[PDB]
RNA sequence: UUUCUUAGUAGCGGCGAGCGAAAAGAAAACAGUUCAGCACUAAGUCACUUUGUCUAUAUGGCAAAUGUGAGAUGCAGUGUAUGGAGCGUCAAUAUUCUAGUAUGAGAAAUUAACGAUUUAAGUCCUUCUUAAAUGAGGCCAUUUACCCAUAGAGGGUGCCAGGCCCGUAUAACGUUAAUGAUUACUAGAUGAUGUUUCCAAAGAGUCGUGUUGCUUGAUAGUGCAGCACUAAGUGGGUGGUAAACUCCAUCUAAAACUAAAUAUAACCAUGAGACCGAUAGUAAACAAGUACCGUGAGGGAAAGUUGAAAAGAACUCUGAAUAGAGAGUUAAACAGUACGUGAAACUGCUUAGAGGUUAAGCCCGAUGAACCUGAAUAUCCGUUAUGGAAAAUUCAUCAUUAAAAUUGUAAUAUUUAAAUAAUAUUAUGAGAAUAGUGUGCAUUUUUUCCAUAUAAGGACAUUGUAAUCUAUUAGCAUAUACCAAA
RNA sequence: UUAUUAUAUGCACUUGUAUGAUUAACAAUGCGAAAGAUUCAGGAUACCUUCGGGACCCGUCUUGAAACACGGACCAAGGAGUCUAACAUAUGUGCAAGUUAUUGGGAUAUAAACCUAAUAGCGUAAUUAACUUGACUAAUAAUGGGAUUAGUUUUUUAGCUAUUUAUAGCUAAUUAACACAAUCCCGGGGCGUUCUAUAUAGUUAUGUAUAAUUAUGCCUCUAACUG
RNA sequence: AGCUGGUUCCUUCCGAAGUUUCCCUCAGGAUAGCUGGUGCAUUUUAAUAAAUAAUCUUAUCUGGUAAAGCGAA
RNA sequence: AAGAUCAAGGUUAUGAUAUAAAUGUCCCAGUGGGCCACUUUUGGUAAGCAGAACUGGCGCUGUGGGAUGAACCAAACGUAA
RNA sequence: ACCUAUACAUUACCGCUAAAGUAGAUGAUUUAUAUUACUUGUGAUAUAAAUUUUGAAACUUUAGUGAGUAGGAAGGUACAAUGGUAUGCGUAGAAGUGUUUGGCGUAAGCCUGCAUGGAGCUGCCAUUGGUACAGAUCUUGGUGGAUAGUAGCAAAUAAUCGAAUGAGAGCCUUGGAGGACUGAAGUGGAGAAGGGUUUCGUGUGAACAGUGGUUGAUCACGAGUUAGUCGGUCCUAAGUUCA
RNA sequence: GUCUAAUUAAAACAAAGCAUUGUGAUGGCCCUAGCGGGUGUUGACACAAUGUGAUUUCUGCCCAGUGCUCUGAAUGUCAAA
RNA sequence: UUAGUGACGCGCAUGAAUGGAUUAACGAGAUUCCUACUGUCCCUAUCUACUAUCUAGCGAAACCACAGCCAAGGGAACGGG
RNA sequence: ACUUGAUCUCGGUGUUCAGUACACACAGGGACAGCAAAAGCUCGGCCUAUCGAUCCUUUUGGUUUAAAGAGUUUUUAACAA
RNA sequence: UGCUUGGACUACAUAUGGUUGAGGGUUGUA
RNA sequence: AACUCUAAGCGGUGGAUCACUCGGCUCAUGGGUCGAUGAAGAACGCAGCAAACUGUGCGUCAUCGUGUGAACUGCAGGACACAUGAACAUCGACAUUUUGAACGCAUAUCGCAGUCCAUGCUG
């Protein structure tokens, strides 16, 4: 009832002082989490501690499509051209989210090229030897030549300056866009109505012949 | 940050009633808690100051997911700020291998808005949604709007 | 799952008061799956009871009785719709490969956790003080640093102790877990993908629907439940505004298993605090959930501190004695068991003073008492003139010699290319001084002391007179102008 | 013609008058007399005394409290306008058409500091219920024009000062430009609403013809846009 | 708890109101008025007026009280 | 009729003044229980009564004065001669 | 004529407001002189003497004014903590505290002396608050006047002679003695319900017995409650515990 | 005869008497959310529920209103299914 | 005889188990007249025991702004100041 | 006598005093008229009272928007008065 | 046996195994 | 005079104030460890001297084993068994009462049975 006043939809009316997570544990958690990565990196092998192979392409928000969210999707279709081999993939890494329908087949291009520029980097270590299909190399052994094991998975992306404010060559200037942009949307709105008019025109003709 | 040494409540010791008037003493909730009664006692205070307080301007839109409508706006006031500064002077040149093709969509602005008056230099703007007026001044600058994914 | 967000919003709401989430987007952490239902088609399965063997300190495993019992009123098993199985084709396809157990490997190889040992170095002199040095000062040399130093974190110890001790830094040792390599034995499996073909088995009084109540943001239901009605497999559900029609997209319920991120006022093991400091802090620093109250549930305190060491006052005396007085002890009893320190309220005594005017208390002014505080120097018209005595030596009047700086200027570099400017470096000239010599280094000078002097030995303080100044008060003495009346 | 007054009265010296709060000539006395310490002056310290005058009990609600209003015997110590979330205004600070790292990760001399991926928040367009559309003018116009406004540059002139007379600065009059900010006004223009030009007309494309949805031509039914 | 009581150091400077309106309002708020603070823009109302603000006067309007009237409605 | 462009005008066209004024923000406290007097007045016989108009005090104000006293008179108070 | 308010006038002084300057120091300014230039008289320069190192987020300098509740702002003071610092203080006496020590400030308050003391502490600049008390029919602890004694310690008459002992003896310790009491429907002699060592001996002091008190239901130290037949047990009742 | 222990011991209360009401038990009246149970190891000369208040005497008129009741015309009005 | 009792009863606002009337016996019940009786009184006085009091011993509290001589006056319109 | 301006649309103004809400009134702009010979007048009653917020119910308006995976049609949410 | 003392056992719900059983549930041999 | 008032010194009374503190409080970190194999909690008896706290159960202030290596301590019995071990920790072997989920049934009763094994007495 204060005449510069800020209508207070501040809902602390329900004994909210019992709850309060003070978050005095933030860097204790950060230290623990980092410490845990150190344990995991050693424990799981010369295993490089993430990192599925990260699968992006194409998020769903029409605005939010450089908004890369990381490729858990498990790609049964994309496996095939990688030939590829769902079970074999799991030993390697291959994130098991079998429920995806990636039908924008530019998306099939990107991700298949990923797995292949990977895969050949998967140094093939089999538990005695003998070991079929490395297809590597005793010279090409993890320990001897290559020493790899990194990190964090780059969004890939691929800049964003953009600047496709390149030099084109730009012809289009007989092309009156503004009439067509309102027209295209109107055509879409009126599809069901335009369907009626055809149907009503058909009915009256049937009657007339009658 | 804070000192209660800079508080005047410190200074008001003693001052017997601590700035809270001897006659009418500041006692817990003199006017009724909050926005109460906004149809009664604070009616002056609400239409003053918040007026549209109370009723309805109804068109209940059940499950507006603000991803369908989100549509952020760039003005034709600005629009040339999508072009990096050292390239901005570079296409004032005069040299044509042209016209200026700016991708508005990857700069995250769904819609190009009308606002008006750009330099006569032709701009092609790659944009999802159009102001017809933004296009009208762009076409006067001799560019176009090429309509864009 | 949680956090960041959306969001104090979509939305709900006597649309009043007030309430309100998820999706996409961002991150932490990530991990996947299996029945049952198909033709295994010689129940392939399982519990138990005994005995062989094995060997934990087994409800164990191996083997035999093919001994009972369970089980076709159904269990193995492929296999779970995120599909899957069988044909053929492809494809990998091997004296093997993989797993589970046993193996300590690497002549005890390493890491962590614990117990726990480790130490590198002063208890040197002096002085204070004292109970104590841990205080103050000294400690060659290392460009004056006591010794030590990967440790100058803490506590204990008689104080402000890195060096007195324990620890701390830093590791040694033992144990236990990890890092179980080879190897042995046991068990099991031989891919996965794609094509074509044949099959394609799927949770029910539930889904759903009408009502009701409860609940949510969920609104022409948000979940949940009761009741009535009650399904189905080109089904079913979902697609936050009910319906029918026509579609699409999207999963696959009415079944089951599953780490991590995520919680933690209890418990155990631990570490911190611009936390509190004994009416505080937890109820409880303590024979504290005690003592104590209440029939009971329950209610539930107050209350820390001698000293370095008890050295806790022997002894003598008075008193029945507790106590007192002497004495001892103690650095101090001005620490003698409300005991560190020691307040106020209050009281006794002593000391001063008064007492019928307001009961008492009070402020100011004047004033006495006790009590206290403040207290300066050289000059009329100036303190300089003059004389003596001492001392100085870069300077003394200045010259020279050496030393380094300052003022002004320039260059070479940097700063800002370049300029001005500034800065580093370097150099020149002008000078001034710190040391040395020199007329003299008291020929003299200068520096430093002392005496005497003109009204006068004065101006801190208080006093006299007179001249003035500001505000003012109160008289004196001198002389006019005009008007009325006369 | 006479009287009166001021100027023509400089330089030296001066305990002369003032110099805008001009107290001192002159003098006496106490006395700083080494440490020690006399003597003088001055004092509502505590408190006592003596005299006059004044002093009614604080806190509080209340129009008014010394009240025959209420609490308070007396004293000590605890003891009451806070913290937090979210907010407005003032101001400072950082950066600024952007800002906020600390969700998290990299790292550590460690719950800190240093670094910081990516989003998201807010701002950068609003208004209609929403569909929707879009602030026009101009690269510019701090919204335009206009009226009051500063500060500057600036025409031209005057006075003053300094000056080498070249010259500059101040003050006043004055012409023009920016003139923001500040203040005021009439508008324009995004959105809604009304009257209504969007009566109708033009333009493009569909559509059609032609070559291969497209291009070209034509119509401008239809669809779209605009005054 | 809109009620009663109390609220903890000082000095300096300025300094109220018990009124308006609305309210189950009338022992209270909000609101306007009075109050302070923070400043800001300009001073011919400013730094070494030919621009006003608001009080007299003047000029120019208004009024139905005092008085008067009832042999005026 | 406005906006308004241009040219003409001795002295700015009552009087004192300006403690400088105007303007904005806080949406700030405090107030929403008044009390008294001159004058004017209504209700009431009247009241230290209930209620207006204008203005000043008191509220928030001692001091001097009315012997005394919230309010009346004189006067607004830094500290002293 | 006289008397007389914090009014009025003047003056010193406080504060607040106002108004103005102050910020070439390798420089400036004043004073005296020697030289030089011009001139009568002035400046320049040389020399000698003197002043000037400004919290210029203040001073110098100036004027006008001050009631004041509510309230607002401004600037300090005190208290506990913290980063930094004074190469801070300190058991040779810290902090604390009593204090007619001396002084400072309008005050908030400060320092110091003296006495007591015994182990640690403070000033300044920034930084944070559980930050300052007289009160709240405040809380908690302590203490007065009432009042070293005023209420009272008075119902059931209530003793008393007097031997013993001790520090003290009306009672309470007690005999003897003596006045009486309850007046066997008891102030007796037993038990349950209840009590919980209270019973009893010995020691016997302070506290307790609203008095004393050698004595006690006190205080200290010991001992004592023996059952086939009495109760519990057992049994059922009202009634209950519950598969 | 009873009571307001601790300010009311009565004229109040109770009380015999008097009258009124429901009920044959799958009931009446009653408890429990419910299960189940009280009255009731009771059976109308019983049990339950009321009102007035010995004896004597008297018990009038009023069902319009508000309660209560019914083999009542019960297509009044009238819910969900 | 503002009492009581018997009457009268247009009875403000009596009354019939909402019980009305009458009533023996009963009542630590309400009320009225007379008597007996008395310190209930006129009209006071004395006495017993225990206190109060004083003393040895023992020893609180209520309450308390500061506390305490009146009269009038003003003032919150009744003062210990 | 003739009629429906007691009209439509949008803004202002007065009162109340925040000169705000509300109601009613006053003068206009844009419509469209009504009347009279016209000039003119006329947004109710010569002037001064004659009545009501949000949500909500509903109607009338454009036939417009939404019912968030597409339509269509019922239903439904709405915006203007 | 008698009399007396010590230890170990004796709750309930329930699964499985054990064996005894059981019903005009129901089947069959006779 | 005494008393009273006022002040001061000293002594009481009283425990404020200061400085200390094996405690409290709050945040962070690691771990998951009761029970019919009889819990947590309760009761009961226990130390040379104890009455509690604390510890423990009838083997009672504690026993094995293990570690360390000479105390405990108020006074002492002890101290010896310091080289086989004090005493404290470790505590992995045992004990672990009467109870309590509490289990034969009860519980103003430590009350009363049944069963097996076993002992003495009598025979």
């Amino acid at each position: 009832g204060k005449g510069n006043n800020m209508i207070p939809n501040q809902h602390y009316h329900k004994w909210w002082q019992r709850h309060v997570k003070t978050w005095f544990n933030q860097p204790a958690r950060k230290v623990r989490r980092h410490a845990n990565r150190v344990k995991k990196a050693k424990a799981v092998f010369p295993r490089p501690a993430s990192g599925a192979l990260r699968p992006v392409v194409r998020c769903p928000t029409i605005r939010y499509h450089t908004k890369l969210r990381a490729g858990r999707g498990f790609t049964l279709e994309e496996l095939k051209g990688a030939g590829i081999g769902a079970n074999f993939a799991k030993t390697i890494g291959i994130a098991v989210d079998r429920r995806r329908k990636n039908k924008s087949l530019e998306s099939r291009q990107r991700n298949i090229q990923r797995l292949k520029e990977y895969r050949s980097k998967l140094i093939l270590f089999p538990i005695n030897e003998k070991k079929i299909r490395a297809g590597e190399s005793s010279l090409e052994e993890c320990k001897l030549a290559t020493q790899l094991k990194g990190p964090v998975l780059p969004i890939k992306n691929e800049q964003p300056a953009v600047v496709e404010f390149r030099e084109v060559t730009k012809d289009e200037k007989k092309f009156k866009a503004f009439a067509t942009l309102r027209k295209a949307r109107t055509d879409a709105r009126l599809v069901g109505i335009r369907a009626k008019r055809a149907k009503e025109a058909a009915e009256s003709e049937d009657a007339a012949k009658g | 940050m804070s000192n209660i040494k800079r508080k005047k409540t410190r200074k008001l010791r003693g001052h017997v009633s601590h700035g809270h008037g001897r006659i009418g003493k500041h006692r817990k909730h003199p006017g009724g808690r909050g926005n109460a009664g906004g149809m009664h006692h604070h009616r002056i205070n609400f239409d003053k100051y918040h007026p549209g307080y109370f009723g309805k301007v109804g068109m209940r839109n059940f499950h507006l997911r603000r991803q369908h409508k989100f549509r952020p706006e760039i003005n034709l006031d600005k629009l040339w700020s999508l072009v990096g500064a050292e390239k901005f002077a570079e296409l004032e040149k005069e040299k044509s291998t042209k016209a200026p093709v700016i991708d508005l969509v990857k700069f995250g602005y769904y819609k190009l808005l009308g606002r008006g008056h750009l330099p006569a230099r032709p701009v092609i703007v790659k944009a999802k949604y159009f102001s017809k007026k933004a296009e009208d001044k762009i076409k006067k600058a001799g560019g176009v709007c090429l309509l864009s994914a």
Side-chain angles (χ1 to χ4, degrees), chain A residues 41-164:
Chain A
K42 298 177 180 186
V44 176
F45 51 52
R47 62 167 185 87
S50 46
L53 281 193
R54 41 174 163 82
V56 301
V57 310
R58 294 146 245 239
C59 279
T61 170
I62 355 182
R63 57 173 294 192
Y64 296 132
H65 277 302
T66 54
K67 70 286 183 184
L68 57 77
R69 199 272 192 95
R72 309 183 199 82
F74 284 62
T75 179
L76 290 167
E77 325 181 293
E78 291 169 359
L79 296 175
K80 305 188 190 195
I84 99 175
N87 292 6
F88 196 58
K90 300 160 192 175
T91 62
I92 286 165
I94 76 159
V96 295
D97 282 3
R98 293 181 176 171
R99 262 173 296 113
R100 201 196 218 183
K101 68 192 179 177
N102 210 5
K103 47 197 168 171
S104 42
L105 315 181
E106 287 154 288
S107 58
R108 303 205 189 158
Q109 288 186 49
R110 204 178 198 180
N111 292 346
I112 291 175
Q113 295 175 93
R114 284 205 167 182
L115 307 184
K116 288 175 179 182
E117 287 177 74
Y118 292 118
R119 220 174 189 278
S120 54
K121 297 195 188 169
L122 305 172
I123 310 178
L124 39 151
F125 316 89
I127 1 167
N128 314 274
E129 310 200 353
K130 304 181 180 176
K131 51 174 180 164
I132 325 184
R133 296 204 190 74
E136 282 73 68
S137 163
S138 52
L139 283 166
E140 298 173 52
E141 281 176 57
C142 313
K143 302 180 171 177
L144 300 176
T146 57
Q147 301 186 104
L148 315 169
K149 313 90 217 309
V152 166
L153 316 163
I155 310 183
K156 56 173 184 176
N157 297 285
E158 299 175 349
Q159 304 184 60
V162 187
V163 272
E164 292 298 296

Side-chain angles (χ1 to χ4, degrees), chain B residues 62-73:
Chain B
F62 307 89
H63 265 273
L64 295 169
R65 323 189 184 86
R66 300 178 175 213
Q67 305 166 20
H68 290 288
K69 281 187 173 192
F70 223 149
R71 304 182 196 172
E73 39 266 311

Side-chain angles (χ1 to χ4, degrees), chain B residues 91-109:
Chain B
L91 287 308
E92 299 169 3
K93 224 183 193 172
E94 186 163 282
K95 296 183 187 182
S96 302
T97 44
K98 72 208 302 298
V101 192
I102 307 178
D103 184 22
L104 184 54
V105 189
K106 201 185 300 186
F107 208 69
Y109 294 97

Side-chain angles (χ1 to χ4, degrees), chain A residues 1-8 61-64 66 160 162 164-170 172-173 175-178 181-182 185, chain B residues 34-35 42 45 49-50 53 67 70 83 87 91 97-98 100-102 106 110 124 128-130 132 135 139 142 144-147:
Chain A
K2 66 161 57 172
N4 298 343
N5 47 234
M6 312 284 303
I7 299 171
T61 170
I62 355 182
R63 57 173 294 192
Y64 296 132
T66 54
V162 187
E164 292 298 296
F165 173 49
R166 50 186 178 192
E167 45 191 312
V168 183
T169 58
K170 48 174 181 180
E172 327 184 343
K173 305 177 180 189
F175 50 42
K176 297 186 194 172
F178 65 97
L181 276 135
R182 236 286 183 176
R185 302 168 184 187
Chain B
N35 299 300
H42 291 318
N45 199 72
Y49 312 136
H50 302 283
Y53 204 28
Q67 305 166 20
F70 223 149
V83 307
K87 308 287 182 186
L91 287 308
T97 44
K98 72 208 302 298
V101 192
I102 307 178
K106 201 185 300 186
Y110 230 108
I124 304 190
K128 306 175 68 173
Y129 270 63
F130 77 137
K132 187 224 74 62
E135 189 187 309
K139 283 284 180 174
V144 303
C145 191
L146 181 270
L147 301 324

